[PDB]
Amino acid sequence: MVDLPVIQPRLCTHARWPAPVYGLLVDPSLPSNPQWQNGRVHVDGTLLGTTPISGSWVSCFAAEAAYKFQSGTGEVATFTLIEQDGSAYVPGDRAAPLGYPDFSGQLEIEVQTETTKTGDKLKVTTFEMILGPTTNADQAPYQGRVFASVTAAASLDLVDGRVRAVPRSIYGFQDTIPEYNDGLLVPLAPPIGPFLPGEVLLRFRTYMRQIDTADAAAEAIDCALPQEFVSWFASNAFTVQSEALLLRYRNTLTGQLLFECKLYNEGYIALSYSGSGPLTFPTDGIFEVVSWVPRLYQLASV
Amino acid sequence: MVDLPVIQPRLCTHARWPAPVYGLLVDPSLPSNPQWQNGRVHVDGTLLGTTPISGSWVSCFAAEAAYKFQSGTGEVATFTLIEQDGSAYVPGDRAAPLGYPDFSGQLEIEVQTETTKTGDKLKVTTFEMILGPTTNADQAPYQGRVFASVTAAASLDLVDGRVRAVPRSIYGFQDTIPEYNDGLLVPLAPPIGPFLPGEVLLRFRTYMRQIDTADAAAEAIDCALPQEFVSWFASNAFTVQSEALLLRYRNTLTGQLLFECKLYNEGYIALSYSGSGPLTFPTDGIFEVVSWVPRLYQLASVGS
Amino acid sequence: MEDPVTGPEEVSGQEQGSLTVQCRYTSGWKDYKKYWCQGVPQRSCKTLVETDASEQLVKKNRVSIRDNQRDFIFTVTMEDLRMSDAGIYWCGITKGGLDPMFKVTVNIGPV
Amino acid sequence: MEDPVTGPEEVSGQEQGSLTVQCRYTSGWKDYKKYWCQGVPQRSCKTLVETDASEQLVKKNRVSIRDNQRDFIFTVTMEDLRMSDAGIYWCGITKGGLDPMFKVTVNIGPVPT
């Protein structure tokens, strides 16, 4: 029978940005059927979209980096993507290498670099990389090819080599898929859904380090499941016996039931909620499996 | 019966530096009984040292940050530590808040900052923070207080607030515990061990982004278990039924047994290894539990 | 000139009037599409008008562009200026990967 | 002065000779311990000599330090210089948290011809 890790959401890892889960909420005002590509797993353990097993791969990429100074742009990186375990990336039935960012904006990335300049050798360099939604950089992670740059008055004298780019900050965040293939379609995990009438997506929320020259408001990003649930399902390879699982989210020290919900086999959780605005929930509960239920099982409202 | 997650080491997360696991090896030339404080878990699920559940907490810290410009130093951050879920840090029977770095050197950290300066507001700022082994900074994460700075000619005009510091690079890495309490001893997970004669620690290895002005060699850091094994034991809370666990590391496509090893209850894997130099292993195998065994169980040895 | 393209750092126009921007480039970029782009982030900026890599003048709504491929200068015009036209713009040259771009700040004076 | 402590950015001496370093500070740091540190990382440098916050001389091996708390200068003397003495050193003032420090590069060469 399916079970779930005994871990409070606040101790869990976000599945779309490398940070803790900080929030648990429903919000019917947000897009109902997001097409997130990370944090997507089937209850039978099948990874969907670009979802990786390891949280450390989330919103990162690995590449053979080649650098060239371009007067008036700076040092330009051409990244030939590989999978983050070092194996070759081959275009296939997903949008990009595992873990590749599945949102838009301009990302600051950090990579190890090596210079031939006298007096130093190894340092970490921050590059800027446009993700999407549309760009003039002709990004094609689906083809294993993306471009980044760093302002420089003159050449940094970098040595080409293998990198793993990790995210420093997002600028102009938009929760819409990035440019995966220079404007062309790619294979995608479908939109999250469907929901019964009155059901809404349960969101696990974290916040993204941000550049914003005017607004101090935090940048929220949601995912359908914590990363620990992804690796749990991928490891256990459960057999599914119906279309959804009835869960209870409970304080284990109080016994207080906070809500019941349905985990659809396709890897997203629904609550029955008719409110118009956000409803947040404590993050120190535990999800417990109750039973298999069919798609049409009707939940108690929150 | 106790079991392990069906995940290859190369798909796992490192437990002492936030990065993939890249290597799986033994090396008898290295310190045999390291006193790592992260990646430490009992088979019964008890987290040891400063080990957190989430890999995102590893080598990071959360704090209420207070900033003050100091001519000749730059912008100084006084970090009043909290736990990374936002809960209050309470000094107890571990060295520091969960996830706090357990190595030494000079760390570049990244935090969200907010400025009052005209024309911007939010950005990410890199601070330098001395970790250890000994420092003149009087770092005291055990007391919930550590200091960092960024060179600045004039104030950055930063607004005090909550941060989560994530690691950018290490400079002068040393795999020895940091200054946890201004040079005083703190509660620590014990040195990893003991090992039977002929047994050495099985190491999960990753590589740390580095500053080094002269040497291009990669900076290795080892841990006793991938982070997925930590959260697995903490989640399952298995019952201990003898002294140790016999494991097999196997290629699951070919069936090839690569070696057998012992997972001691206290959270580290021993391999019986008779060579003198390092020996690496393929990282696309799977660890499987065979049996409970006594501590004195003699493993089949792996040679040169 | 080492940069592929350069322009005026700042340009000013009056509400209801026009302004002109000369995006000067180097000869190798002759047979490339030229464009005028609006906003940030830089490389997701909104193209307002673009050439087809010939010297044909193009106008789209209030923005015109023409590439002089003898002197290697493409000239942008913005007319009937509105206060909301103020902001960050870019001279751009279309190529594979990262386009050469030059940041032009536009200021609008009222009445 | 506005920086708490300043030293010579570069100081050069010769084999078997001596050199001195003046670590000048502002008056508020009068009653603090002063020290001379060696190496990098900066804030784990090796302390070679440290005063007791008085004007009393301290000497260890070839290194001396003397705080003058009237002119607000602590002077460091390094004697019988050796090529291996060359490197990064620091003027330091001991305080809780981040010490005021100033980077001094020490260069050593043979006496010419």
Ligand SMILES: C[C@H](CCC(=O)O)[C@H]1CC[C@H]2[C@@H]3CC[C@@H]4C[C@H](O)CC[C@]4(C)[C@H]3CC[C@]12C
């Ligand atoms: C930027 C930080 C993320 C660090 C990252 O992990 O890398 C996070 C940590 C906790 C977050 C705050 C949580 C409470 C508040 C929530 C509210 O809905 C928005 C504001 C609020 C103050 C958040 C702001 C962003 C914070 C400070």
Ligand SMILES: C[C@H](CCC(=O)O)[C@H]1CC[C@H]2[C@@H]3CC[C@@H]4C[C@H](O)CC[C@]4(C)[C@H]3CC[C@]12C
């Ligand atoms: C810097 C990267 C870490 C980024 C991190 O994920 O953040 C890692 C990716 C894999 C690593 C290489 C692995 C192969 C080699 C191993 C050998 O023992 C050392 C050299 C070798 C060529 C490594 C260098 C460091 C690399 C490039």
Ligand SMILES: [Ca+2]
């Ligand atoms: Ca394109």
Ligand SMILES: [Ca+2]
């Ligand atoms: Ca914003």
Ligand SMILES: [Ca+2]
């Ligand atoms: Ca001290």
Ligand SMILES: [Ca+2]
């Ligand atoms: Ca090194």
Ligand SMILES: [Ca+2]
């Ligand atoms: Ca382009």
Ligand SMILES: [Ca+2]
């Ligand atoms: Ca101090």
